[PDB]
Amino acid sequence: EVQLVQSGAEVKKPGESLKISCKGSGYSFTSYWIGWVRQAPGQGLEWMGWISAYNGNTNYAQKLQGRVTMTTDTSTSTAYMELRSLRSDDTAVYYCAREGDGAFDYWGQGTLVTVSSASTKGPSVFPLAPSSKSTSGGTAALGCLVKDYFPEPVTVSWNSGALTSGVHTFPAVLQSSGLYSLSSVVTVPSSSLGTQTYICNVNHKPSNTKVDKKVEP
Amino acid sequence: TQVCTGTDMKLRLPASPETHLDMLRHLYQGCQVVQGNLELTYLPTNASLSFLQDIQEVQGYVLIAHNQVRQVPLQRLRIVRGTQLFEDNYALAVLDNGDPLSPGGLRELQLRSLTEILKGGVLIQRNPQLCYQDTILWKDIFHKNNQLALTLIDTNRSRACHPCSPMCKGSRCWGESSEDCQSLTRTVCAGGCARCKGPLPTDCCHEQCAAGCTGPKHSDCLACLHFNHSGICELHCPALVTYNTDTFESMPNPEGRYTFGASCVTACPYNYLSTDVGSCTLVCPLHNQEVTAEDGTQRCEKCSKPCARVCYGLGMEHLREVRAVTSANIQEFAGCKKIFGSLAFLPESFDGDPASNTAPLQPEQLQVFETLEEITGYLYISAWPDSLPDLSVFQNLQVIRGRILHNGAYSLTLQGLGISWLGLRSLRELGSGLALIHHNTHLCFVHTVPWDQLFRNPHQALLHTANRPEDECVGEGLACHQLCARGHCWGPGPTQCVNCSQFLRGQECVEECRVLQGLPREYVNARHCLPCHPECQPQNGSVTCFGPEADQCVA
Amino acid sequence: QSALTQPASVSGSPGQSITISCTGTSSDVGGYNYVSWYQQHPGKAPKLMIYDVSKRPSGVSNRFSGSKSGNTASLTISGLQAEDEADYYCSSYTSSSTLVFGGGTKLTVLGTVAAPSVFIFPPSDEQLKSGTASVVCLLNNFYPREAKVQWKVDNALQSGNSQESVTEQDSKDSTYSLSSTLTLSKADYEKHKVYACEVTHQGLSSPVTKSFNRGEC
Ligand SMILES: *[C@H]1O[C@H](CO)[C@@H](O[C@@H]2O[C@H](CO)[C@@H](O)[C@H](O)[C@H]2NC(C)=O)[C@H](O)[C@H]1NC(C)=O
């Protein structure tokens, strides 16, 4: 089918240059234009520009000018957003999408590009705990915790994903110590708990520290 | 130059794909106006059409079909007239410009000067990569008085369209550029006037204009709706002769003009006959017959009793429906020196036609054309009996005029034949159009014909391919007999020279005539060698003759 | 340069139904009809609905219907099928050959003004050792988007340290959670014995409290 597949996520230091790739398939690549939009963490969509994959013509943003360059390569069906002189705050989601009548109908998966001055440190894996001391009259809650880490994201799956029930996770927040935190509680029966296996997959591929942390009474 | 003639192939498939574009480039190369039909079909995906780029008018319809080029550069085409129409409805047709078995296909019409369409409608269909056609306000293109404004546009696509340029007022464009924005010239005008260059009445175009204007005057037009007679647009051209109000006797009108296409012309162009009224034609009006001056040209004039009958060829009164020359009609050419019409000989002809019990034409009936010396329409040969090595039966043919061209382009066509040389010895001129000689395995002596000498207009050429290679001709020995001046022949021998750099005894070259020696005894005139009396001087003395009878041969 | 304006605001009541607005200038939406709308669910690409001002791709629900006099710019949803909550985006084509996005608006449907379930957590004898002792509270199921949290570090109304994020309006039961915890390095935890969390939400019967102690079992 129609597929727009982008690069793995990026982490870049101030002064450096980013270079995301977007490979389209299953549709005739030269036939359509390709555009680039980005989303700074919890914020608005921001159109960056578009490319003619047929003739190479490009419109850009007027705020990014000097600093962008989109290209394609017909032979390999790929588009190449390139953002130079990265300085913060370009941090965003960075989609590439296939352009219809001034409008995009098929996107890429996304590409988190993170630009901060600081280096990479992992999370703080902690099991908060519940017994009858934590009974609200017949149903329970429990979940691990994540505090003081870098950079995003932090997958918190629950029992190999083989329990998507009552699991309710929070936005990362920037602390006074400069690194984020959150939670991850599973609404499940204090009909069951402990007795049941509530294992949290607290990944951090930025640290590559796959952590299995099971929480029980 | 300025004017060219179109073509009339319709949808029919190019006999010589390898010369087909090379044809087109020749016809349209410098051309600003095409009296005829702009037909661009079958063009292969990577195919330079830069010659098309000067065309402003198309007098009949425009047909772009079965192509794969992605552009067809007619930015300058400005008005079509739809004199004639595709399927009798359309002044502009784009069909089937897709793919059949970086895709192929036309992507944007880009007809960005096309404001006028005088007669006929628009049919666009089956074009996979074609964008913006449905952006276009077609009723602004169609003339007011245009009776045939029906329109049949398809939008099925297999790709999608960028927006129109930001400069597009109302977002109607012939393509992705600013340059492609549809200029409006009819629906937005002040008052009921039919064309204008702006919304103010002050912008209204002179009523004689057609596509728009730089100003208010009939000097300020983009195209004339009737006749361009100098800087000025008028409804008709000045008459050729003013009458005397008492006598009513013709007096030559000093500032009088002929009409040629849509122009007021001083004198008719080369291959066209001028006429009593004031028109330039390819065919005389009803009660006329063709004249000729010592001045090489021809005129039409009226006749003394109901005119002396003449031979009509194919495509003409009576034969206008018939595909081919055949036994059922071969007799009808009994000893004609000049045929009004064309001859074509098809497989159909020499093979039988049992579909209506008509007999296979025999290699010897063809001799009816031995007297033939002028053809007004074209010659088209595609089958020809194996027996005959050449086209000798036309060895007295001296002019093919082209006035009617095969498929709109070819005065001379020999193809798929078996002949071994050409033998049109007395063919001194192809009046109009191009020759296409292709796919004749055994054809030598093409290279020898000085084809540049036959042609008249510079949009003319021979297109040849799949013939016997000259290398294989020079090699295997066949070549111009040494008596053939400047090396040009139509075949093997001294019978076949185009010019004789010694003398001519009949239809043959001879290094000397028999005025000194030699048996059946002779004498010399205008480079020839004519016989003397059955009984004049049998001698071995000096200069023994001077003439034909016993009147002048000195005894 | 030079974003369109929308309100983050629509609200509305399950069943039906309200409309978003765009709007922007003669040079953009007020001049072009290449005006398109997007539905973004949290942490996903945008969905394409609808384009040209008023038209729907395949699969897009009936009574998504944008149209209107420029310079606005007006998407409308009609039955509020329950899960239509998303951030919503208008975009337009531009006299500068550029795509331009509106600031977005957050659609959010109404329903029962529910009351919170409040479990009470620590962080762990795994947590404390690093020099950290976070006192924790979640806000399970409720409405609307504000209540009053008031930690009890042995009865002291501290302020600062009471961190905060918020999940998207729960997609099956129209509710909010909310992140409320306490910054507590191993320095500020020792001479306090009782630790309660009071969640004063307008939806319960009066301010409700549920309590954890420092060293039971
Ligand atoms: C008809 O009038 C004359 C034809 O003799 C044309 O005058 C030329 O046409 C264009 C621009 O007008 C240019 O080729 C030349 O600048 C003009 N003068 C020349 C050829 O020296 C005129 O174009 C024709 N007008 C129309 C409307 O067809």
Greatest Cα-to-Cα distance within chain B, rounded to the nearest angstrom: 100
For residue B285, how many other CB atoms are within 10 A of its CB?
12
Resolution in A: 3.1
- Phi/psi for B24 (5° steps) reads -45, -45
Q: Hey, is B203 helix, strand or coil?
A: helix
Does C32 contact chain B (CB < 8 Å)?
yes
CA distance B472 to B464: 16
Q: Hey, is B139 helix, strand or coil?
A: helix
- The amino acid that residue B444 corresponds to is C
DSSP codes, B23-63: HHHHHHTT-SEEES-EEEES--SS---GGGGG--EESS-EE
Token pair 């049998």 is found at: B538
Q: Hey, is A136 helix, strand or coil?
A: coil
A76 contact partners, CB below 8 Å, separation of at least 6:
A23
Which two structure tokens, joined as six digits, stand for B168? 């597009």
CA distance B157 to B173: 17
A151 with A177, same domain: the answer is: yes
- The amino acid that residue A111 corresponds to is T
Q: Hey, is B416 helix, strand or coil?
A: coil
- Which B-chain residues 172-211 have CB contacts (< 8 A) with chain A? 176
- Strand-strand pairing, B410-415 and B374-377: unpaired
B479 contact partners, CB below 8 Å, separation of at least 6:
B448, B473
| Cβ–ligand 1 contact at B3 (below 6 Å) | no
C104 with C12, same domain: the answer is: yes
Instruction: Considering only the beta carbons, identify the residue of B159, B162, B163 that sits closest to A28.
Output: B159
C107 with C186, same domain: the answer is: no
What's the B231 CA to ligand 1 centre distance in angstroms?
7
The CATH number that applies at residue C87 is 2.60.40.10
B286 contact partners, CB below 8 Å, separation of at least 6:
none
Which two structure tokens, joined as six digits, stand for C114? 């529910």
Is residue B83 within 8 A of residue B59, CB to CB? The reply is: yes
C4 with C104, same domain: the answer is: yes
C57 with C137, same domain: the answer is: no
Question: Per the structure, how many domains does chain C have?
Answer: 2
Is residue A131 within 8 A of residue A141, CB to CB? The reply is: no
DSSP codes, chain C: ---B---S-----TT--EE------TTTTTTTS-EEEEEE-TTS--EE--BTTTBPPTTPPTTB----STT----EE-S--SS--SEEEEEE--TTS--EEB--EE-------------EE---TTTGGGT----EE---SB-SS---EEEEESS----S----------TTT--B---B-----TTSSTT--EEEEEE--TTSSS-EEEEEETT--
Last residue within a domain, chosen from C111, C144, C165: C111
Last residue within a domain, chosen from C55, C84, C111: C111
Q: Would you report the helix, strand and coil content of chain A in percent, each value rounded to 5? A: 5, 35, 60
C88 with C187, same domain: the answer is: no
| Cβ–ligand 1 contact at B265 (below 6 Å) | no
Is residue A158 within 8 A of residue A164, CB to CB? The reply is: yes
Is residue A48 within 8 A of residue A56, CB to CB? The reply is: no
C107 with C120, same domain: the answer is: no
C102 with C44, same domain: the answer is: yes
A102 with A199, same domain: the answer is: no
First to last CA, chain B: 63
CA distance B359 to B548: 46
A132 with A110, same domain: the answer is: no
| Cβ–ligand 1 contact at B199 (below 6 Å) | no
Is residue B297 within 8 A of residue B291, CB to CB? The reply is: no
A159 with A70, same domain: the answer is: no
| Cβ–ligand 1 contact at B221 (below 6 Å) | yes
CA distance A82 to A94: 11
Residue span of the structural domain in which A52 resides: 1-117
Is residue B205 within 8 A of residue B115, CB to CB? The reply is: no
Q: What is the DSSP letter of B328?
A: H
A79 with A146, same domain: the answer is: no
b or e along C37-62 (b: 16 or more beta carbons within 10 Å of the residue's beta carbon)?
Answer: bbbbeeeebbbbbbbbbbbbeeeeee
Nearest-5° Cα angle at B475, B472 to B478: 85
Q: What is the DSSP letter of B353?
A: B
Q: Hey, is B92 helix, strand or coil?
A: strand
Query: Domains of chain B, with CATH numbers?
Result: 1-194 (3.80.20.20), 195-306 (2.10.220.10), 307-501 (3.80.20.20), 502-555 (2.10.220.10)
Instruction: Considering only the beta carbons, identify the residue of B102, B107, B160 that sits closest to A101.
Output: B160
Q: What is the DSSP letter of A76?
A: G
A50 with A137, same domain: the answer is: no
User: What is the position in ligand 1's atom list of the atom closest to the CA of B224?
Assistant: 27
The CATH number that applies at residue A204 is 2.60.40.10
Is residue B502 within 8 A of residue B483, CB to CB? The reply is: yes
Q: Which of B132, B134, B161, B164 to mutate to test the interface with C (most CBs of C within 10 A)?
A: B164
First to last CA, chain C: 61
A195 with A151, same domain: the answer is: yes
C66 with C82, same domain: the answer is: yes
Residue span of the structural domain in which C45 resides: 1-111
- Phi/psi for B472 (5° steps) reads -80, -5
CA distance C184 to B555: 151
C48 with C7, same domain: the answer is: yes
| Cβ–ligand 1 contact at B475 (below 6 Å) | no
User: Could you tell me which residues are beta bridge partners of residue B530?
Assistant: B523
- Which A-chain residues 92-131 have CB contacts (< 8 A) with chain C? 95, 97, 100-110, 124-130
DSSP codes, B475-539: HTS----TTBGGG-BSSSSSSSBSSBSSEESSSSEESS-SSSS-SS-EEESSSBEEEPPTTS---
A156 with A189, same domain: the answer is: yes
Taking alpha carbons only, the member of A99, A119, A121, A117 closest to residue A108 is A99
Token pair 């607005």 is found at: C21
Is residue B85 within 8 A of residue B37, CB to CB? The reply is: no
Q: Do C177 and A182 touch (CB under 8 A)?
A: no
